Amino acid sequence: PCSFGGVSVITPGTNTSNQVAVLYQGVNCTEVPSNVFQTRAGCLIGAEYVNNSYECDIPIGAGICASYQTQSIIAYTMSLGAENSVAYSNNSIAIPTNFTISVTTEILPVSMTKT
Amino acid sequence: SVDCTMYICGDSTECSNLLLQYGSFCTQLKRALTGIAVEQDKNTQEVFAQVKQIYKTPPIKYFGGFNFSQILPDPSKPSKRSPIEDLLFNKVKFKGLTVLPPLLTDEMIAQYTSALLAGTITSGWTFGAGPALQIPFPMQMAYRFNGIGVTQNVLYENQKLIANQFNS
Amino acid sequence: AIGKIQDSLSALGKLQDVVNHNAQALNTLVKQLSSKFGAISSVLNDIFSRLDPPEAEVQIDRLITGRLQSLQTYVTQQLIRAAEIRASANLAATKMSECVLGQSKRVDFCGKGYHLMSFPQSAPHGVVFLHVTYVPAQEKNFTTAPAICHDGKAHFPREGVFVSNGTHWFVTQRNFYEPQIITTDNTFVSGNCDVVIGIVNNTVYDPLQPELD
Amino acid sequence: KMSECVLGQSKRVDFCGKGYHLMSFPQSAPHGVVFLHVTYVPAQEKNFT
Ligand SMILES: *[C@@H]1O[C@H](CO)[C@@H](O[C@@H]2O[C@H](CO)[C@@H](O)[C@H](O)[C@H]2NC(C)=O)[C@H](O)[C@H]1NC(C)=O
Ligand SMILES: *[C@@H]1O[C@H](CO)[C@@H](O[C@@H]2O[C@H](CO)[C@@H](O)[C@H](O)[C@H]2NC(C)=O)[C@H](O)[C@H]1NC(C)=O
Ligand SMILES: *[C@@H]1O[C@H](CO)[C@@H](O[C@@H]2O[C@H](CO)[C@@H](O)[C@H](O)[C@H]2NC(C)=O)[C@H](O)[C@H]1NC(C)=O
Ligand SMILES: *[C@@H]1O[C@H](CO)[C@@H](O[C@@H]2O[C@H](CO)[C@@H](O)[C@H](O)[C@H]2NC(C)=O)[C@H](O)[C@H]1NC(C)=O
Ligand SMILES: *[C@@H]1O[C@H](CO)[C@@H](O[C@@H]2O[C@H](CO)[C@@H](O)[C@H](O)[C@H]2NC(C)=O)[C@H](O)[C@H]1NC(C)=O
Ligand SMILES: *[C@@H]1O[C@H](CO)[C@@H](O[C@@H]2O[C@H](CO)[C@@H](O)[C@H](O)[C@H]2NC(C)=O)[C@H](O)[C@H]1NC(C)=O
Ligand SMILES: *[C@@H]1O[C@H](CO)[C@@H](O[C@@H]2O[C@H](CO)[C@@H](O)[C@H](O)[C@H]2NC(C)=O)[C@H](O)[C@H]1NC(C)=O
Ligand SMILES: *[C@@H]1O[C@H](CO)[C@@H](O)[C@H](O)[C@H]1NC(C)=O
Ligand SMILES: *[C@@H]1O[C@H](CO)[C@@H](O)[C@H](O)[C@H]1NC(C)=O
Ligand SMILES: *[C@@H]1O[C@H](CO)[C@@H](O)[C@H](O)[C@H]1NC(C)=O
Ligand SMILES: *[C@@H]1O[C@H](CO)[C@@H](O)[C@H](O)[C@H]1NC(C)=O
Known part of the structure; x- marks a missing residue:
């Protein structure tokens, strides 16, 4: 078949910016018709690919997000979270000496309009 | 996902214009x-x-x-799986009909499951209510027996038996 | 801590989505009336005005079939979507019983942390739960041991853990640091000091003898 | 189950495996999750008055 696929537009919202990048899913960047980056998920146009990893801001897909940080728009590999080693030993314990009271919300729908 | 135009018409301009008479x-x-x-x-x-x-x-x-x-x-091993997860993963463009990839890859799920495993072995059930608090494992298992109605001395005097039975 | 809740509000996207999904099905259902479905026109009066009955019955029957299909699509989706809001109402009713009318031990069912209490609030087409939880803070590390030897016998805590501050050993409760001296009223005896791995020597004080001088 | 079987100890009968729940360990699967449930099961009863 003569390579085909959907076209989606990535936008931060017109109240933030009017810049957009376009991913052509599993389309090679030589057969589409600046910042052109080839990924195994398709051809990414309009974002620069960096080797750092940040918290996800604008989600693109397959582990890659974009953000307006360092301004045009960038493509980068997402960070998963902070890292932390527990100080385990065979005769050590950790016990709290103080506490806080927290409050959190949870929201649940219960009904629709009757038509 | 399915592209409705390529399924129904399939690169045909006479059909494509007729699709306009059906609305949305x-x-x-x-x-x-x-x-x-x-x-x-x-x-x-x-x-x-x-x-x-x-x-x-x-x-x-x-x-x-x-x-x-x-x-x-x-x-x-391939990526980073446990020996048991390897059994679990080893045992299991037409005309618009497209398959989209998941957002989380299998390597990313393995990293979530290995973090849960590390927390429950080194920190018991404390990391799910705040900061991870270390406690030795033999003492975690004694607490867990207490929570079901068994005194803790029953574990400590039989520790070798319970470890042998678990490992088998 | 409760006062901060208003700041986080002044969220409810799950409630707006319910409104949006029905508004979109009603806007689509009406718009589907302006479709010809391959007929000469889309208006059942205009057909007659410019056509004889023998042929007008066919053209109107096509439009009827098309718009009847629209109603079948609409009603099928309302049944599938009503099952989802029903499953949500069942979860909300279950939390109302178990989070508001009592104290739950179910992890993460009534908020993050150790459940103390919850307060309901009414929302349009929904419910909001204010979850009050207990969160420990500011930990210190200590050395510990499963049991203590005294008179050749093993002593185990009734409730709590043995800790050491560097030079002396105490009994503490597990959820708040509050040390007390290890006595015969705080502990119980079971077995000898030959089966416990990691048992340590210390003094367990008997209140009887210093009362008898 | 992830919260109530792995991040804690449950008393719900049969919810976290058969027997008295002690602990659980997750494993990943291609489109799902596999739980390993560790339970306590009594054995060898005797008669008493
Ligand atoms: C436990 O934490 C609270 C703070 O969350 C401590 O209370 C504060 O103590 C300082 C002095 O150390 C006072 O200046 C503050 O006014 C206190 N805050 C409140 C809200 O009262 C409390 O002292 C801590 N306990 C220990 C043992 O450190
Ligand atoms: C834990 O169990 C693993 C097996 O699941 C043990 O690894 C085996 O060890 C023996 C002895 O060295 C070897 O002959 C096997 O080839 C090992 N298996 C694998 C897959 O490498 C391991 O030794 C055990 N750990 C402890 C501390 O006993
Ligand atoms: C409790 O039962 C276990 C078996 O479930 C007993 O352990 C076995 O004992 C036999 C006989 O000595 C050994 O050959 C096996 O190797 C043991 N199994 C394991 C896994 O260690 C145990 O002795 C019983 N306890 C009592 C007090 O009778
Ligand atoms: C551990 O705590 C004890 C008790 O507070 C400390 O020992 C001393 O104990 C005598 C009674 O036997 C008290 O009169 C002293 O005031 C205590 N000293 C202090 C500084 O509290 C001991 O010092 C603590 N150990 C460490 C390493 O801090
Ligand atoms: C905890 O583990 C440490 C090792 O990491 C143990 O320390 C060893 O203890 C033995 C005697 O049991 C000594 O011969 C070694 O020289 C020690 N090793 C080091 C590096 O100091 C310690 O005994 C363990 N604790 C328990 C209760 O088993
Ligand atoms: C804890 O105290 C007991 C009782 O004093 C110690 O048992 C003695 O151990 C020594 C060897 O270390 C023997 O020579 C004695 O015969 C034992 N005494 C008795 C009454 O059996 C024990 O060793 C101490 N534990 C530690 C770690 O010091
Ligand atoms: C406790 O005692 C009862 C009898 O009071 C035992 O019942 C036996 O059950 C077996 C079947 O499992 C029958 O075939 C026997 O006839 C019964 N015996 C009698 C005397 O009625 C029961 O087995 C005993 N339980 C244990 C755990 O030993
Ligand atoms: C949207 O625009 C309004 C002004 O019209 C502004 O107050 C608000 O912060 C904007 N929102 C975002 C997310 O930028
Ligand atoms: C696109 O085609 C070029 C050759 O023209 C090739 O080198 C490149 O690897 C192709 N990209 C992909 C993603 O296949
Ligand atoms: C990212 O690192 C790889 C090596 O891991 C290197 O080949 C590549 O050029 C780097 N990308 C950029 C944009 O520097
Ligand atoms: C306890 O000690 C460990 C090192 O053994 C350290 O990493 C940890 O931060 C300490 N905890 C506190 C509260 O100091």
């Missing part, structure tokens, strides 16, 4: 399939991404006699 059926079709495709990534975040930190076990993998090497990642 393709709008409904794209939204119906997209609305349930977004939930599929949400389903996997709610199961595995229940920990804030990525916990690691100590290099001295040895816990009161309990052997956890079959459930912890094995630094010598």
Whole structure:
């Protein structure tokens, strides 16, 4: 078949910016018709690919997000979270000496309009 | 996802213009399939991404006699799976009909499951209510017997038996 | 802590989505009336005005079939979507019983942390739960041991853990640091000091003898 | 189950495996999750008055 696929537009919202990048899913960047980056998920146009990893801001897909940080728009590999080693030993314990009271919300729908 | 135009007409201009007489059926079709495709990534975040930190076990993998090497990642395998997860993964463009990739890869899910495993072995059930608090494992198992109505001396005088039975 | 809740509000996207989904099905259902479905026109009066009955019955029957299909699509989706809001109402009713009318031990069912209490609030087409939880803070590390030897016998805590501050050993409760001296009223005896791995020597004080001088 | 079987100890009968729940360990699967449930099961009863 003569390579085909959907076209989606990535936008931060017109109240933030009017810049957009376009991913052509599993389309090679030589057969589409600046910042052109080839990924195994398709051809990414309009974002620069960096080797750092940040918290996800604008989600693109397959582990890659974009953000307006360092301004045009960038493509980068997402960070998963902070890292932390527990100080385990065979005769050590950790016990709290103080506490806080927290409050959190949870929201649940219960009904629709009757038509 | 399915492209309605390539399914119904298939590169035909006479048919494509006729699709305009049916209204917004393709709008409904794209939204119906997209609305349930977004939930599929949400389903996997709610199961595995229940920990804030990525916990690691100590290099001295040895816990009161309990052997956890079959459930912890094995630094010598495809990506980073446990020996048991390898059994689990080893045992299991037409005309518009497109398959979209998941957001989380299998390597990313393995990293969530290995962090949950490290937390429950080194920190018990404390990391799910705040900061991870270390406690030796033999003492974690004694608490867990207390929680079901068994006194704690029954574990400490039989520690070798329970570790042998668990490992087998 | 409760006062901060208003700041986080002044969220409810799950409630707006319910409104949006029904508004979109009603806007689509009406718009589907302006479709010809391959007929000469889309208006059942205009057909007659410019056509004989023998042929007008066919053209109107096509439009009827098309718009009847629209109603079948609409009603089928309302049944599938009503099952989802029903499952949500069942979860909300279950939390109302178990989070508001009692104290739950179910992890993460009534908020993050150790459940103390919850307060309901009414929202349009929904419910909001204010979850009050207990969160420990500011930990210190200690050395511990499973039991203590005294007179050749093993002593185990009734509730709590043994800790050491560097020079002396105490009994503490597990959820708040509050040390007390290890006595015969705080502990119980079971077995000898030959089966417990990691048992340590210390003094367990008997209140009887210093009362008898 | 992830919260109530792995991040804690449950008393719900049969919810976290058969027997008295002690602990659980998750494993990943291609489109799902596999739980390993560890339970306590009594054995060898005797008669008493
Ligand atoms: C436990 O934490 C609270 C703070 O969350 C401490 O209370 C504060 O103590 C300082 C002095 O150390 C006072 O200046 C503050 O006014 C106190 N805050 C409140 C809200 O009263 C409390 O002292 C801590 N306990 C321990 C043992 O450190
Ligand atoms: C925990 O169990 C693993 C097996 O699941 C043990 O690894 C085996 O060890 C023996 C002795 O060295 C070898 O012959 C096997 O080839 C090992 N298996 C694998 C897959 O490498 C391991 O030794 C056990 N750990 C402890 C501390 O006993
Ligand atoms: C409790 O039962 C276990 C078996 O479930 C007993 O342990 C076995 O004992 C036999 C006989 O000495 C040994 O050959 C096996 O190797 C043991 N199994 C294991 C896994 O260690 C145990 O002795 C029983 N306890 C009592 C007090 O009778
Ligand atoms: C551990 O705590 C004890 C008790 O507070 C400290 O020992 C001293 O104990 C005598 C009674 O036997 C008290 O009169 C002293 O005031 C205590 N000293 C202090 C500084 O509290 C002991 O010092 C503590 N150990 C460490 C390493 O801090
Ligand atoms: C906890 O582990 C440490 C090792 O990491 C043990 O320390 C060793 O203790 C033995 C005697 O049992 C000594 O011969 C070694 O020289 C010690 N090693 C080091 C590096 O100091 C310690 O005994 C363990 N604790 C328990 C209760 O088993
Ligand atoms: C804890 O105290 C007991 C009782 O004093 C110690 O048992 C003695 O151990 C020594 C060897 O270390 C023997 O020579 C004695 O015969 C034992 N005494 C009795 C009454 O059996 C024990 O060793 C102490 N534990 C530690 C770690 O010091
Ligand atoms: C406790 O005692 C009862 C009898 O009071 C035992 O019942 C036996 O059950 C077996 C079947 O399992 C029958 O075939 C026997 O006839 C019964 N015996 C009698 C005397 O009625 C029961 O087995 C005993 N339980 C244990 C655990 O030993
Ligand atoms: C949207 O625009 C309004 C002003 O019209 C502004 O107050 C608000 O911060 C904007 N929102 C975002 C997310 O930028
Ligand atoms: C696109 O085509 C070029 C050759 O023209 C090739 O080198 C490149 O690897 C192709 N990209 C992909 C993603 O296949
Ligand atoms: C990222 O790192 C790889 C090596 O891991 C290197 O080949 C590549 O050029 C780097 N990318 C950029 C944009 O510097
Ligand atoms: C306890 O000690 C460990 C090192 O053994 C350290 O990493 C940890 O930060 C200490 N905890 C506190 C509260 O100091």
